[PDB]
Amino acid sequence: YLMKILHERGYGFSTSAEKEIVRDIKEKLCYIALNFDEEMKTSEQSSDIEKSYELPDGNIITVGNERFRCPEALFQPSFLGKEAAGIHTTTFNSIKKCDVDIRKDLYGNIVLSGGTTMYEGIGERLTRDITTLAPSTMKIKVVAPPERKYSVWIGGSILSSLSTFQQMWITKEEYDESGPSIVHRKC
Amino acid sequence: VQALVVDNGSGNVKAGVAGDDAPRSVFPSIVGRPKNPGIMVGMEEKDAFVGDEAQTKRGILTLKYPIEHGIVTNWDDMEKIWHHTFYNELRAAPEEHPVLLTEAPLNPKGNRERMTQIMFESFNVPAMYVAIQAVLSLYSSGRTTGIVLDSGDGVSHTVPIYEGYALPHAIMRLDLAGRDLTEYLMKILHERGYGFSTSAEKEIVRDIKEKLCYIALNFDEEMKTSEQSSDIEKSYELPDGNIITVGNERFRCPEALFQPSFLGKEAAGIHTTTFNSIKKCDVDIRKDLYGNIVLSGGTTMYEGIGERLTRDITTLAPSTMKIKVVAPPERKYSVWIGGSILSSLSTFQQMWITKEEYDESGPSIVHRKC
Amino acid sequence: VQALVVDNGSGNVKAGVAGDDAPRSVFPSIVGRPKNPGIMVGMEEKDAFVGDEAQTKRGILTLKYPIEHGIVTNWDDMEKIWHHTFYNELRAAPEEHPVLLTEAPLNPKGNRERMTQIMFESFNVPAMYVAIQAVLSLYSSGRTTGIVLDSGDGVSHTVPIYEGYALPHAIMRLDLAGRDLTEYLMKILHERGYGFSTSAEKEIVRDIKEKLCYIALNFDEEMKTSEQSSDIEKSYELPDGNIITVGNERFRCPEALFQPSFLGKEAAGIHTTTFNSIKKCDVDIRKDLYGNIVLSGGTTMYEGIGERLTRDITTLAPSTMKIKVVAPPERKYSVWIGGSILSSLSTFQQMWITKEEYDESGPSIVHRKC
Amino acid sequence: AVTNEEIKTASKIVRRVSNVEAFDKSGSVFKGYQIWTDISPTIENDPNIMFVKCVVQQGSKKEKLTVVQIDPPGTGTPYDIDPHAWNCNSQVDPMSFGDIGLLNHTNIPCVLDFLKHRYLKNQIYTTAVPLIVAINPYKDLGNTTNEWIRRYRDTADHTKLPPHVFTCAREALSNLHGVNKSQTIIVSGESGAGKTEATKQIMRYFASSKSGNMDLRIQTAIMAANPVLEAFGNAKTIRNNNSSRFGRFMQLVISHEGGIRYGSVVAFLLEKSRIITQDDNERSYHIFYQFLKGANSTMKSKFGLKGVTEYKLLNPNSTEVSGVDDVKDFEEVIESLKNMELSESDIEVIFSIVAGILTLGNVRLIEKQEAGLSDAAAIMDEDMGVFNKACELMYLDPELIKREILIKVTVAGGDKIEGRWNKNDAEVLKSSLCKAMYEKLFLWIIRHLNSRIEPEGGFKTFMGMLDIFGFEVFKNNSLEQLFINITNEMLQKNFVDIVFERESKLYKDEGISTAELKYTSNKEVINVLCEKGKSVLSYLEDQCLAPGGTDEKFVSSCATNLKENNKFTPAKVASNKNFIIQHTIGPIQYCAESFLLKNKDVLRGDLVEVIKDSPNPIVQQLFEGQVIEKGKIAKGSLIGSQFLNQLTSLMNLINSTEPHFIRCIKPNENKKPLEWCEPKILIQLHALSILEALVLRQLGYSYRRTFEEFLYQYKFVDIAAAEDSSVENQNKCVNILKLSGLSESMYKIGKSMVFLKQEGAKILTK
Ligand SMILES: C/C1=C\[C@H](C)C[C@H](C)OC(=O)C[C@H](c2ccc(O)cc2)NC(=O)[C@@H](Cc2c(Br)[nH]c3ccccc23)N(C)C(=O)[C@H](C)NC(=O)[C@@H](C)C1
Ligand SMILES: C/C1=C\[C@H](C)C[C@H](C)OC(=O)C[C@H](c2ccc(O)cc2)NC(=O)[C@@H](Cc2c(Br)[nH]c3ccccc23)N(C)C(=O)[C@H](C)NC(=O)[C@@H](C)C1
Ligand SMILES: C/C1=C\[C@H](C)C[C@H](C)OC(=O)C[C@H](c2ccc(O)cc2)NC(=O)[C@@H](Cc2c(Br)[nH]c3ccccc23)N(C)C(=O)[C@H](C)NC(=O)[C@@H](C)C1
Ligand SMILES: Nc1ncnc2c1ncn2[C@@H]1O[C@H](COP(=O)(O)OP(=O)(O)O)[C@@H](O)[C@H]1O
Ligand SMILES: Nc1ncnc2c1ncn2[C@@H]1O[C@H](COP(=O)(O)OP(=O)(O)O)[C@@H](O)[C@H]1O
Ligand SMILES: [Mg+2]
Ligand SMILES: [Mg+2]
Fold this sequence. Notes:
Chain A has 187 residues and is mainly alpha-helical. Chain A contains 8 helices and 4 strands. Helix content of chain A is 39%, strand content 6%. In chain A, the strands form 2 sheets. Chain A has a two-stranded antiparallel sheet with strand order 1-2. In chain A, a hairpin with a 5-residue loop joins strand 1 (51-54) and strand 2 (60-63). In chain A, helix 4 packs across helix 6. Chain D has 29 helices and 24 strands. The C-D interface holds C 40-46, 87-88, 91-93 and D 542-543, 545-549, 552-553, 556-557, 560, 572-576. One adenosine-5'-diphosphate (ADP) binds next to helix 6 of chain B. Chain D: InterPro entries: Kinesin_motor_dom_sf, Myosin_head_motor_dom-like, MYSc_Myo14, P-loop_NTPase. Chain D: Its main location: membrane.
């Protein structure tokens, strides 16, 4: 999607290495707005929303709206033409599919993870979107730790460094007995 | 009264008054400037030769096209081509008529803003809509549901439309067109023993590409049967009087459309960007999109592009669906003809961009009516 | 003269003029809005596609059903469906006829009050009774003593009636229906390797659920015999042309009706809510209620639901009584057919809610005639 | 008889405006006032009646009127009605005058009783002013012979004459030889309502003069060639076995010393889509059927003709009609062509063209899935002898006609490329070919009828006559009935033009400000139906050019763009198949099925030149003018566009002249004298806009009367003023008006007349 809006600005990235350059632009320049319509209307008057970037060619990229409409497709997926729901509505929609007692303990811990939650103000935008969707008597407390890119792997350390968990491996001889179907019995 | 339909093609401006079946003006997008000083006193200087006169005097001119991949790289040259088109070729004033320009999908915004800024400041046009070449070709196709793959000299679009609704998450453009095939044809003619380097030589290579290149059905089989040179070699006569003898270069000249790695590009072929644009649509409309693969543009005028395209997509598609390409005659003009049919409607006349509305909003209003 | 029988189903509006054997209009309760802007000038805009046209254009629409578990969640969508039903599909004016709406038991009061407020303020209906879907299915069943278990797309009722008298302390509803089985079928197809996420993909999952799912006789035996994949795998062709190969998902797709803990709900199965509704009745009428387990609704159109339901209830019931399910053909329409037979009576015409009576009491009169 | 669509439709026509008058004074007293009601068991038993004159019973309520049915004489049982009570003019003999504007109450049943009484007294005419009203007696009343021509022609005073055709036609010829301005008499009505009979009355009145009494062959030529225009031109609809689906328009040059010496017939707005498809109970144009049954074995053997059910242009289930012979009528067609002196070889070529059209309509097309395209238009195999026979009978090279049907060719910067047509567009080429050959055949033989009788220098000034239809009020309307209602909105706009012009200039001549007269704007309906760029017809041109055009997209596109005016309204039931237009006569519903089958007409000039290159000079005379275009005819070749050009030229021919109007109404459907049926007659009142013409008649200072006729008519109101003859007659009349309690806003003082509104006329007559 960032390649498509950069086709709108005047840059054409088509190959795979060009997609990786678009990934470096997406890491260094994209950030989630607090209110998207207000940032569009204030970004109609281009004051500070335009930034620069230097390529491995030495040119200059000047980005305008594409700092805050680049990650906005996570929250409004109809920019990508998908009939899905945003991260706030699939999260809150996953809260409403739980039972009605545990939700206080689930509105309280919205744990972020992965490298696509490394933007600016994803905790702020996510709390105001869920706080708009949730009942207003409950506080929404997102947990956005640093090193949330590695929160999978770090947990993979802590899980594999236990003594009870070592009763749960799938040994070589057990695969030699059951085949791969044993993995559907220990997951 | 009648609108004025101008196709700003990458290699052929095709313009004419609306309500016609064929353009009055089919002339290339060429600005040529003389590399040599004139010496005969009693002649026209004319520092910029524009249009077909620049091609009839091609031996003494530096010939430049202002359109690199659907994008104006030199606005003075494009303003000269529009000036020649309106005043010297169509012979109709811009103040008398509304103009209907056209545009590649995923064209940068500076072409629209600078384009309408030219057409309201330099030319005094009362009203003007700019449009997509592919949706106009689907007007002239006689349908409202299909996939247009355009291929001119700058672009190669694949715009799917299901029942009047565009799919802007599935428009896939491609920078493979007639100009890259002329350049690649020059490289393989360097392999045969002919050296074409200048601009007029590129136009001679374009005439060879029109008269001799054709798309093979299976490329490896035509290579192996063309190892034994029996009928694959042809002849051609130049404006010098010599003889060109082409061998493989009849069927590897347009094969770069389907295997772009000959050109060293990390892109996909026309069949894989078309089918790849089918897979980016939703899964109900694909039966109505595998059924109408509408060809367009002058780079689909080869032999057996319908046959090769149907066997490639039929290889890629699920085998239970029939692939029906629509390759009409006059598919070179299917943009412009649609530009007539669009501009000859009564609802469409509620959609122009008037002079006073540009005087209010500036060029940004064109990003609100497109 | 003749009444107008409208079944506001959760997934199929089934409406038609009274005194018939089958509805004229069987079309789904779908309001779809285009997610994409139109680009072909010379088309219909039509911001809300309602009914079967919304399903024939499913690839370009956000398709939303206004009925979540027998309850209208969006009254503008339901008013569009009623407007399409009366004017565009039945082609009969609401002023000409009385309308007979229907309603799932234990529906909140706001659906009745807002519903009759719509049908007297927006539509100008002279008279209207709203009714229970289960008692209408027992009219069409040809009996006056039995248990109706309804199962549509929002509800699953179990209304017992002994000789014309309702048992309102034994009406047990259940939120297991066709829509939860489509969602669960999407999850197990995520387990097989197919990803259906959008709304049109949910409708394709509904066609798979209709053509391929069937209720097993004993589920553990079919799991153990389906460990050795011999004949349990089937194929299906999409509107894309691919092939779906289903394995266990023919008999674990409707098994969530009988073991709701697959869906993670703390409810009871259809056999235990039915038998649990037998045990909430008094102890004399149960012989006449174990004898008539009347099925209804489109979620009882599976294979062997009579056989599995009789062996489950026969396991639960005392063994001296025979369990006789009544699974008629056209059990999808057993609501509407009963709505004909109820509205084609002479005593029932003393029970309408006239226009002037709504003009006196407001909507609260509907809570006095139900 | 009268049907339930006529009883229901006429019941919908019935409106209520003025309140019912029951009282004498402020006390609750009645005068034995006779009223009208629609609630009577006579109406519930006789469908020939919709209004019953009763008499208000004494001591009834104000909210509920106790009445006794007296007209018709039912029982003397007083029953109660909702004040469903209409006013009546009971004290007025309908044979005393002939102008419905002189009635005090101009509701619907006073007009039905006025025209009912005058028709049942065999007085079939009634001057609406400036209208005239003809009702068919289905016989001769004797007042049409040459002695009555001399009586209504030769008197020095003509306003003492009763209403007639001869009186209004006398006004037209008097305005012809008085001032050099062309007058045009517009005979409007249903085609069975005796428009041809009243037409022949105009033909004998124009024929007869003071010296040149029968010094003409023009009525002999046109009236002898009547079943040619009736042969090609009449088709059965659900209203007539002999309906007129176009307009005959005859421009006659009148001698001062004599009568007609020069003239012409030009038809206008000939419907073309009737040739291709018809309805169930509708025939095609009759010459197809009566040609398939009237020909001999030499003509059928030469033309290869078939049975009347074996032609797809022809409705296979409405060929048999009891009222039309279809065999011996064709001999009147042959002799009627011999009356304009056409040779039997040329007549044989004419019906060779007709047999070629009916042969061409059987030619089937197929889609070829193997071309450069998706599908290709191709002609079916066993229809090839049908096609070669079809071009042979039309004297055309069939290879070049097939070239024009299946192949398009254009030149784009010097590049003749041959595109292949689609099947449906080639069906539009074949259908457009049949319709164009038929209409230019028709106008060709009209040019032979005018070749006898024309003024060879042209028409400087003339005397026009327009046979024309009325409003198709009924439900199942289509593109043809839309064109009908559009033409009636044009003629209606001409009516408000000329009534506002006469009444405005007559306010000017008597010193009264014409600002108190108001133009009733037909501009909204003409803008919604006709204005190029924002009409219904412009968007029908769009759906002919929108490539995936359906009919639902048309009704919905007009629904979403013409919502700014209320004169378009989408219908409730089947909102994409039905749209309701607010015409001047009110809401008319239109069905939307098969619009694009009817409008799509592509007559490409590349084919027109191939037909002009025929070996037959007859076929060369068929297509005259009509230069090649070589581009899109898509802006102008549609039936909407051709309809706006022919309608533009016809309204140019009528608006340039000064008109006079004839309303023809037929009382029953059994063709019987003195049989009266208020529903069908009321539909003809609303269907010639006679009711709204009475609204325009009762608009403004309706009831004016001259000072001598006011002082004679209302002599007995103030006998002391009128018999004085020393005080001025103006002062006498306004003393009568101030005596009866009339404010000066209701009456204006003319120099020749007393000017009264309908309020002042009702307060004056108390
Ligand atoms: C950082 C990059 C480029 C440059 C150094 C960055 C600077 C910033 O670009 C310009 O200012 C030049 C101009 C441009 C022209 C007008 C304008 O109002 C703004 C920019 N843009 C162009 O010429 C387009 C031409 C084009 C091709 Br063909 N198809 C395309 C499809 C969509 C859009 C555009 C195009 N262009 C340079 C390219 O695509 C090339 C292939 N781009 C790249 O691979 C890399 C190196 C991206
Ligand atoms: C139709 C044309 C030429 C001729 C009449 C056509 C005939 C057919 O050529 C020959 O047979 C001659 C020969 C030749 C030599 C060996 C051989 O096994 C085949 C051909 N080729 C050459 O001498 C090259 C030399 C060359 C220059 Br420096 N750089 C180059 C870069 C790459 C390749 C080659 C070259 N050559 C003639 C040219 O480029 C000239 C400038 N060509 C032209 O502008 C036009 C007129 C093309
Ligand atoms: C009938 C359909 C698809 C095809 C024609 C049917 C055939 C049968 O699928 C394959 O065989 C391909 C493969 C597949 C891969 C491995 C395997 O052992 C079996 C199948 N499956 C995939 O690539 C997943 C990818 C996927 C996305 Br992203 N998220 C997902 C979430 C969960 C699961 C999977 C996914 N996939 C194709 C899709 O979701 C797409 C979007 N599916 C559809 O909308 C429609 C058209 C369903
Ligand atoms: N007969 C032909 N065979 C092969 N290629 C052709 C033929 N005619 C034209 N072309 C190529 O197609 C191109 C046409 O470009 P054009 O139709 O103008 O597209 P655009 O309008 O987008 O510029 C020409 O440059 C030419 O190279
Ligand atoms: N043949 C079938 N097999 C399985 N399920 C079916 C079948 N037909 C219909 N259904 C399911 O039944 C549902 C129809 O229920 P319906 O009768 O409409 O209930 P309601 O009238 O309450 O909406 C559909 O959603 C569909 O999923
Ligand atoms: Mg082009
Ligand atoms: Mg149901």
